[PDB]
Amino acid sequence: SHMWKIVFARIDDRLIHGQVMTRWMKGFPEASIVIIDDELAVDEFMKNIYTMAAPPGVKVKVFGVDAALKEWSQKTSVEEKVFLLFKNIDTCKRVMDGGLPITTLNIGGVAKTPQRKGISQSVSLSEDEVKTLLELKTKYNVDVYLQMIPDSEKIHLTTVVEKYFPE
């Protein structure tokens, strides 16, 4: 089997913050958190911050994109359950384009910028970003939805397009 079994994937530009991941990990009891980000992979200060902020009893590992693809590609007799955490859509696209199978993609946090349209308190998206999410759905059959925490409002990608980007 592949080294990792991907139990969930989430995009949140603030990664491990507050109690958010403690809430998410309760749904994935045996999983570790794997953050895939090229910037964080070399940033020792923030690697320590996020490791310290991790839910009690949950391992955190950080990989760059190429290293994540290399690790996942390895075969093993005992797979590790992993909850993938990305800072941004582009990094997720790069790993999916590299063959890493993601089945569900939760958009958790994307900060407002002038180029993005506000959708929720936690998520704003540009038209280009929504086009990218649609492309991931089309190419890879990923189920994409916005949801901040497990018990908060869930908005599917199709609903996002219909209400916020009619086109």
TrEMBL record:
One of its GO terms (cellular component) is cytoplasm. Its main location: cytoplasm. The keyword Transferase applies. GO terms for molecular function: kinase activity; protein-N(PI)-phosphohistidine-sugar phosphotransferase activity. This is Phosphotransferase system, mannose/fructose/N-acetylgalactosamine-specific component IIB. Residues 3-167 form the PTS EIIB type-4 domain. InterPro entries: PTS_IIB_sorbose-sp (IPR004720), PTS_IIB_sorbose-sp_sf (IPR036667). Keywords: Cytoplasm, Kinase, Phosphotransferase system, Sugar transport, Transferase, Transport. GO terms for biological process: phosphoenolpyruvate-dependent sugar phosphotransferase system. It comes from Caldanaerobacter subterraneus subsp. tengcongensis (strain DSM 15242 / JCM 11007 / NBRC 100824 / MB4) (Thermoanaerobacter tengcongensis). It is found in: Cytoplasm. Pfam families: PTSIIB_sorb.
